Design a binder for these strands. Sequence first.
RNA 1: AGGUUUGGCACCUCGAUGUCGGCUCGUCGCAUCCUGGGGCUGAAGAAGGUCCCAAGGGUUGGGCUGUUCGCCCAUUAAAGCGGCACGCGAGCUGGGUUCAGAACGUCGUGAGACAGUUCGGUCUCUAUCCGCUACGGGCGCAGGAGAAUUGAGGGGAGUUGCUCCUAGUACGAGAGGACCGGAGUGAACGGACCGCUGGUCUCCCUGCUGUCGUACCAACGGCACAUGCAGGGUAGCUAUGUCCGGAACGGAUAACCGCUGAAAGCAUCUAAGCGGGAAGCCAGCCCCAAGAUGAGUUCUCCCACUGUUUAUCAGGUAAGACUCCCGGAAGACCACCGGGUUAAGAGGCCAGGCGUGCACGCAUAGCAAUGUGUUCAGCGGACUGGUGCUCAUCAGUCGAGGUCUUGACCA
RNA 2: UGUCUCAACGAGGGACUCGGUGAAAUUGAAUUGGCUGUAAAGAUGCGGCCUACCCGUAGCAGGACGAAAAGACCCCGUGGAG
RNA 3: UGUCAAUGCACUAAGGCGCGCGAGAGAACCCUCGUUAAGGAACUUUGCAAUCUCACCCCGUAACUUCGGAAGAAGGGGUCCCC
RNA 4: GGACCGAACCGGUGCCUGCUGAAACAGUCUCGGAUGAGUUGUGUUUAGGAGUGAAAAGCUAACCGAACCUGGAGAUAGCUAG
RNA 5: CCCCGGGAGGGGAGUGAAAGAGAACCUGAAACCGUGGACUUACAAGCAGUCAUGGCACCUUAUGCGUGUUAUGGCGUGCCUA
Lengths: 116, 58, 134, 113, 206
Amino acid sequence: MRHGKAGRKLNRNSSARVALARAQATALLREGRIQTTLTKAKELRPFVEQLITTAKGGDLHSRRLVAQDIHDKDVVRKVMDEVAPKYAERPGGYTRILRVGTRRGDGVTMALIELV
Amino acid sequence: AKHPVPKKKTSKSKRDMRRSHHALTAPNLTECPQCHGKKLSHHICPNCGYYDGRQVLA
Amino acid sequence: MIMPQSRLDVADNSGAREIMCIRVLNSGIGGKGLTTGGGGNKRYAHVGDIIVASVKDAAPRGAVKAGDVVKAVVVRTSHAIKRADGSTIRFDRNAAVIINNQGEPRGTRVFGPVARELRDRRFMKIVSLAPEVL
Amino acid sequence: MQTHIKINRGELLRGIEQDHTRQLPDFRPGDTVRVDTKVREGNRTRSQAFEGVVIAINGSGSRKSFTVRKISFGEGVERVFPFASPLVNQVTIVERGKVRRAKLYYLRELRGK
Amino acid sequence: MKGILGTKIGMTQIWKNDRAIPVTVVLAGPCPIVQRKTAQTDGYEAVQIGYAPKAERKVNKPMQGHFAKAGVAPTRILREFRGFAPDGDSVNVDIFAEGEKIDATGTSKGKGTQGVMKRWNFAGGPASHGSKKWHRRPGSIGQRKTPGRVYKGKRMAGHMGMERVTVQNLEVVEIRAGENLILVKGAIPGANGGLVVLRSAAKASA
RNA sequence: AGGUUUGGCACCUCGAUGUCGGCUCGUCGCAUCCUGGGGCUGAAGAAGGUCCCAAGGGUUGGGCUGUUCGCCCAUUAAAGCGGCACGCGAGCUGGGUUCAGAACGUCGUGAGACAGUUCGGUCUCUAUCCGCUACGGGCGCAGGAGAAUUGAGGGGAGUUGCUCCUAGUACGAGAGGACCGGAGUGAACGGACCGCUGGUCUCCCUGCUGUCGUACCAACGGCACAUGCAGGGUAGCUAUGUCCGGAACGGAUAACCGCUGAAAGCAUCUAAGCGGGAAGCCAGCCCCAAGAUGAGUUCUCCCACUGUUUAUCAGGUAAGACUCCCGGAAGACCACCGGGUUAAGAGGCCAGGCGUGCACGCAUAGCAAUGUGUUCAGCGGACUGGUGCUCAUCAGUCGAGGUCUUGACCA
RNA sequence: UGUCUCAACGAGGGACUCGGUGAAAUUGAAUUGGCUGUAAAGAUGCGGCCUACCCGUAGCAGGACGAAAAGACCCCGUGGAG
RNA sequence: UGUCAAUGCACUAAGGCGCGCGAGAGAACCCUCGUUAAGGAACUUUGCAAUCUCACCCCGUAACUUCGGAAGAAGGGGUCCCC
RNA sequence: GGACCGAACCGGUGCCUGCUGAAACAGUCUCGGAUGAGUUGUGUUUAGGAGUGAAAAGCUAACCGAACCUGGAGAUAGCUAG
RNA sequence: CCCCGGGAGGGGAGUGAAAGAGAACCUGAAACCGUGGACUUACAAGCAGUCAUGGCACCUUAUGCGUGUUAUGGCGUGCCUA
Ligand SMILES: CC[C@H]1OC(=O)/C=C/[C@H](C)[C@@H](O[C@@H]2O[C@H](C)C[C@H](N(C)C)[C@H]2O)[C@@H](C)C[C@@H](C)C(=O)/C=C/[C@H]2O[C@@H]2[C@]1(O)CO[C@@H]1O[C@H](C)[C@@H](O)[C@@H](OC)[C@H]1OC
Ligand SMILES: [Mg+2]
Ligand SMILES: [Mg+2]
Ligand SMILES: [Mg+2]
Ligand SMILES: [Mg+2]
Ligand SMILES: [Mg+2]
Ligand SMILES: [Mg+2]
Ligand SMILES: [Mg+2]
Ligand SMILES: [Mg+2]
Ligand SMILES: [Mg+2]
Ligand SMILES: [Mg+2]
Ligand SMILES: [Mg+2]
Ligand SMILES: [Mg+2]
Ligand SMILES: [Mg+2]
Ligand SMILES: [Mg+2]
Ligand SMILES: [Mg+2]
Ligand SMILES: [Mg+2]
Ligand SMILES: [Mg+2]
Ligand SMILES: [Mg+2]
Ligand SMILES: [Mg+2]
Ligand SMILES: [Mg+2]
Ligand SMILES: [Mg+2]
Ligand SMILES: [Mg+2]
Ligand SMILES: [Mg+2]
Ligand SMILES: [Mg+2]
Ligand SMILES: [Mg+2]
Ligand SMILES: [Mg+2]
Ligand SMILES: [Mg+2]
Ligand SMILES: [Mg+2]
Ligand SMILES: [Mg+2]
Ligand SMILES: [Mg+2]
Ligand SMILES: [Mg+2]
Ligand SMILES: [Mg+2]
Ligand SMILES: [Mg+2]
Ligand SMILES: [Mg+2]
Ligand SMILES: [Mg+2]
Ligand SMILES: [Mg+2]
Ligand SMILES: [Mg+2]
Ligand SMILES: [Mg+2]
Ligand SMILES: [Mg+2]
Ligand SMILES: [Mg+2]
Ligand SMILES: [Mg+2]
Ligand SMILES: [Mg+2]
Ligand SMILES: [Mg+2]
Ligand SMILES: [Mg+2]
Ligand SMILES: [Mg+2]
Ligand SMILES: [Mg+2]
Ligand SMILES: [Mg+2]
Ligand SMILES: [Mg+2]
Ligand SMILES: [Mg+2]
Ligand SMILES: [Mg+2]
Ligand SMILES: [Mg+2]
Ligand SMILES: [Mg+2]
Ligand SMILES: [Mg+2]
Ligand SMILES: [Mg+2]
Ligand SMILES: [Mg+2]
Ligand SMILES: [Mg+2]
Ligand SMILES: [Mg+2]
Ligand SMILES: [Mg+2]
Ligand SMILES: [Mg+2]
Ligand SMILES: [Mg+2]
Ligand SMILES: [Mg+2]
Ligand SMILES: [Mg+2]
Ligand SMILES: [Mg+2]
Ligand SMILES: [Mg+2]
Ligand SMILES: [Mg+2]
Ligand SMILES: [Mg+2]
Ligand SMILES: [Mg+2]
Ligand SMILES: [Mg+2]
Ligand SMILES: [Mg+2]
Ligand SMILES: [Mg+2]
Ligand SMILES: [Mg+2]
Ligand SMILES: [Mg+2]
Ligand SMILES: [Mg+2]
Ligand SMILES: [Mg+2]
Ligand SMILES: [Mg+2]
Ligand SMILES: [Mg+2]
Ligand SMILES: [Mg+2]
Ligand SMILES: [Mg+2]
Ligand SMILES: [Mg+2]
Ligand SMILES: [Mg+2]
Ligand SMILES: [Mg+2]
Ligand SMILES: [Mg+2]
Ligand SMILES: [Mg+2]
Ligand SMILES: [Mg+2]
Ligand SMILES: [Mg+2]
Ligand SMILES: [Mg+2]
Ligand SMILES: [Mg+2]
Ligand SMILES: [Mg+2]
Ligand SMILES: [Mg+2]
Ligand SMILES: [Mg+2]
Ligand SMILES: [Mg+2]
Ligand SMILES: [Mg+2]
Ligand SMILES: [Mg+2]
Ligand SMILES: [Mg+2]
Ligand SMILES: [Mg+2]
Ligand SMILES: [Mg+2]
Ligand SMILES: [Mg+2]
Ligand SMILES: [Mg+2]
Ligand SMILES: [Mg+2]
Ligand SMILES: [Mg+2]
Ligand SMILES: [Mg+2]
Ligand SMILES: [Mg+2]
Ligand SMILES: [Mg+2]
Ligand SMILES: [Mg+2]
Ligand SMILES: [Mg+2]
Ligand SMILES: [Mg+2]
Ligand SMILES: [Mg+2]
């Protein structure tokens, strides 16, 4: 049974679940938009949304919080001093997804997730 | 050998009997409003890349 | 939740140090003494219930030696005992008090607290001997 | 299948529950006297008191409770009071404790001085 | 006899003369009489009462004209109550009296496809001493050739929960009539936010 | 009489019908262990004996032994007897006896043997059909649709103690000690539920070690499990935790008890007739149910479109669905429920609750390990609302024109 | 001390759904129900009576005297070998 | 690097690899795991299995003996950081 | 020191898992030896009623109470099938 | 030479009596897989046939004549071996 849910196991253990959502947040932040499986995108959406909301605070604490997950110093810098400040007057919804059909090899359906 | 095993070979009729359920569903394709090609719903028109505006290359 | 095989401590000077229960009864003290049982299937001893038990260990210079079968009433569960207002109780160790077939304690005194529920089930003298009816 | 009435079940529960909620002195894992009423002894209303360390606090509203642990004649005891239980008179802070975690069950198997 | 519809809101702690009482809170929101079933017209006596409102933009034309003939706003939910003959509309007010016993019907929380241990209390096999029947796994289902089928109605893995369920002779602890709140002792079937019917205790005590 | 024992016989099975016991799961008989109703008694009461009716439900936990049995412990209303391939190994054990090793006793010159005794010793991932539990698709149910429903029939349930009142009464020299009716509280079992008490809660919060890294310090991340370890822990799920249940009334019956009563001028419960009478039968309680093809009933909706004897039935549409999208205390898939811009569905954002237990940074005290303040701090999964910041875009598929006969009412 | 009363919650790997590749043992043919009876003596397939719309998917193991090895026990052969 | 020592264990350097189907779902059941109220062998043929124990210091250590041993008997204590 | 603990190494104790396997004997866990009657490489010698064997009728090229291959040979088959 | 295709494969054109021989190259049976059409089947119990009758369909050993299919009724225990 499962009448309350944090998201997905994907098909991975606690350690990986994390390492993935971290890496994919890092790439969407470095890259503005990326396409991946529709699932992994839906799973990415709130992690990265909350991450930008953390960095939106400006003080050293929020930067060190972001450093906890985005372990590449330049992406954290960009999110801190570039992207979050831009999202200043935006109350969430930093992120959007749109779906782009189906893949050849596994016949899986990819989609794009991009900064708003 | 193989604990459970089947008893008599199944009939040409009953075998196609079970299969009355494997027909594929055709996509509900629709006409893209800008590229004048066909596209899956709630996805991005592959031909022109458009999705109200235009997101993907080519 | 006392059940057969589970070893209790004795809260009386009756001379057992600790018993091991071997049955779980129904135990109305009931004007002619203890009642006959209330069904042969009850599974768990609670505070206030009576149990049969072997006496696995005993005081040298006893009134009650090792190996006597005996009937003790239970007075301290590690199990929570909840109450009509909402409160719960619970003691660090399970313990009982050996008693005769009219229910009265066999020792001269009880040792440690006893659950107020003993007063509920008319165990007058056990309640009277104990230092605190918690 | 389930009704979809527009409803804040939050505040429906809150109205019920606030009629039977009661606030107490601010303790926090260090010890106190719970003075309380045993109507339970006969038709008379005897009084009795439990002084012990507070080893946890749980819930909120009707449901909030706190847990005292004392030693009576050698055997340890713990008890669980609803703040709003009618069989509870006044709590009062005997002491103030410098504890370092919300729950602090480590004193179950510490019993000493 | 008496009946009404409401949503299950939750369970809490209470007191009445120093007895702690678990209670389930229920919203017996006012119900409207959409249909009246005479025997002389529909072959038996009953009343069709409605519950959770919905906006007419979501109400298709046939249901619209149903509700419209009766003069009522559209309701997401409708039910019949046998032998009721109410008037005006069926509010929980006074329809239940404090301290009444009442039959509470609801819908079991849906537990999906349960095994035999969960479903029928099987208590399958030993977890050591050497099986691969450790978990559920019923033992036998028959007895060799003797009828040589397995019995109809056999207990087996299946869909547990999601059943209709009635629990009889729950007590009415409290009635906040103006709020349309009804406080009932003990548990009621199904999850919060669900539909539930309170009706007069069908097995009235002697 | 039965067919559960040992047997006779040798009928199917030697191109295989796996055998003892346990476990699991049941279900049937009744020649009834308990409960329910009766007759008789060497039946005062109580406690019994024994026979008749009765198969609804119920029928405990351990020691010894492979055991089945049986003896014992401690209970019980009772601790029933049998069938079902001595039920049940494509369901599990493998303790027992029917393989190879080895030993004792015994027999045999021997090889070897057994009525024996003893330690050891491979139990075969994929269900075709039928049968069963769950779940869908199709068609049907004389138009096409959305809902509400009668209940033919079917399933579940069905146990029992203790105490108290009657009443220290009837009864009995006494000790003792009732039926009938009326209360109350338990056990076991079951259904639902998560407020309580608890369990868990694999990354929600903290603490801790080694080592590697983000240049260094400080602060963090990885690995130590598929959580490195430890301490807590919300929603959810959950029992040992709660709440509810077994019925009352009624109809026909069993043994049996009677009324009226002949044959048979008396008598007789039966020969006609009639009443009483059980945990059993039917109904009542809960659940399912019109594929009840005998396909039922009620409220509401949409309505008479179009095509030359050539394509003859199809096609645009209505009412209304469906695909698709976002979700769900729904769920393997399907199905079911909610939302989809005339929008609070979900995420996010805000506020709150709850969990953790006082953050970083700075200051300060101290030689330092650390302590103190800023700070009930900081951080925060699943909880309660609000909010148009994100996605629920745009669209496509499908879906009525109502057969005939007979009868009544109408113009 | 989950072996047990008595099982719960959580994890991962399968099992389930979609896209790719795609076996096997077995198979007289099959339009392959229940009771009772009869039959070479344990009937889907004979008789009577009941029940049952067509077709799947996930699952259970009572039947199909289920599968595997022309019984290793037993007897037989004027069979064999140590 | 750490840890009495070590080719042990943990993390890691150089170096080498992620094991030639993939994506979701988060039912029964099966495997390999983590925790568990009260009870603690009542399980069973048998504590089978799985817990518990666990390294190094210190104190302490029985019947019996072939005087070597039984012996790591049994049991108790310590273990971190700083001056 | 046919002493102790214990890696390598040699081994194979109990349970599970595997049973149309990853594998015609294995895997994880656990367990025995671990300076000796020890482990191992290369070269070489002994064979069919024969060799070897700290001895099970074990092993003698994946099934040894007498190996494999060819041959006598279409052995013989009071037996079963057709 | 031309067309669709990365190719494979094919469709034309041309040679040839013939491509109804095209290099997966004589014939090309059957099992086995498919497409289209006639007649038909979603209340039904079945060794699958057989007899009987009605319906529908077609007429090249062929208009009383059938041939194909079908509904309902009756009847009906595969083959072989032993
Ligand atoms: C399960 C393990 C093996 O089976 C058995 O032990 C036994 C199986 C049956 C039960 C038995 O039947 C019984 O006989 C009785 C005499 C009579 C009885 N009647 C009453 C029905 C009958 O039931 C036998 C004789 C049947 C017959 C077809 C046969 O000979 C099968 C042989 C082998 O395939 C099997 C295995 O599965 C192979 O497992 C092997 O195990 C090794 C350890 C592995 O290394 C591996 O080897 C590489 C693996 O594969 C080979
Ligand atoms: Mg996968
Ligand atoms: Mg780029
Ligand atoms: Mg924030
Ligand atoms: Mg602390
Ligand atoms: Mg559910
Ligand atoms: Mg179990
Ligand atoms: Mg079987
Ligand atoms: Mg049968
Ligand atoms: Mg016989
Ligand atoms: Mg004969
Ligand atoms: Mg055979
Ligand atoms: Mg035998
Ligand atoms: Mg009888
Ligand atoms: Mg009687
Ligand atoms: Mg009497
Ligand atoms: Mg017994
Ligand atoms: Mg013992
Ligand atoms: Mg029986
Ligand atoms: Mg027999
Ligand atoms: Mg048997
Ligand atoms: Mg088998
Ligand atoms: Mg054996
Ligand atoms: Mg001799
Ligand atoms: Mg052994
Ligand atoms: Mg064995
Ligand atoms: Mg498999
Ligand atoms: Mg109509
Ligand atoms: Mg009925
Ligand atoms: Mg029927
Ligand atoms: Mg009196
Ligand atoms: Mg009086
Ligand atoms: Mg008198
Ligand atoms: Mg009475
Ligand atoms: Mg219960
Ligand atoms: Mg239940
Ligand atoms: Mg909780
Ligand atoms: Mg953590
Ligand atoms: Mg660390
Ligand atoms: Mg540092
Ligand atoms: Mg690393
Ligand atoms: Mg590493
Ligand atoms: Mg933890
Ligand atoms: Mg008379
Ligand atoms: Mg009569
Ligand atoms: Mg009567
Ligand atoms: Mg009864
Ligand atoms: Mg009809
Ligand atoms: Mg038409
Ligand atoms: Mg429309
Ligand atoms: Mg929907
Ligand atoms: Mg919808
Ligand atoms: Mg918009
Ligand atoms: Mg809401
Ligand atoms: Mg608004
Ligand atoms: Mg907050
Ligand atoms: Mg200083
Ligand atoms: Mg985080
Ligand atoms: Mg689970
Ligand atoms: Mg899982
Ligand atoms: Mg059929
Ligand atoms: Mg016969
Ligand atoms: Mg038969
Ligand atoms: Mg036939
Ligand atoms: Mg038949
Ligand atoms: Mg039918
Ligand atoms: Mg199976
Ligand atoms: Mg067989
Ligand atoms: Mg033979
Ligand atoms: Mg011879
Ligand atoms: Mg080193
Ligand atoms: Mg190593
Ligand atoms: Mg290499
Ligand atoms: Mg704990
Ligand atoms: Mg102990
Ligand atoms: Mg036992
Ligand atoms: Mg035992
Ligand atoms: Mg034994
Ligand atoms: Mg062991
Ligand atoms: Mg000496
Ligand atoms: Mg010495
Ligand atoms: Mg010894
Ligand atoms: Mg030694
Ligand atoms: Mg040595
Ligand atoms: Mg060896
Ligand atoms: Mg090895
Ligand atoms: Mg050793
Ligand atoms: Mg040794
Ligand atoms: Mg020789
Ligand atoms: Mg060999
Ligand atoms: Mg080879
Ligand atoms: Mg040979
Ligand atoms: Mg020959
Ligand atoms: Mg010759
Ligand atoms: Mg010969
Ligand atoms: Mg070309
Ligand atoms: Mg070509
Ligand atoms: Mg050609
Ligand atoms: Mg040709
Ligand atoms: Mg060919
Ligand atoms: Mg070719
Ligand atoms: Mg070619
Ligand atoms: Mg030629
Ligand atoms: Mg050819
Ligand atoms: Mg066609
Ligand atoms: Mg065809
Ligand atoms: Mg028909
Ligand atoms: Mg026919």
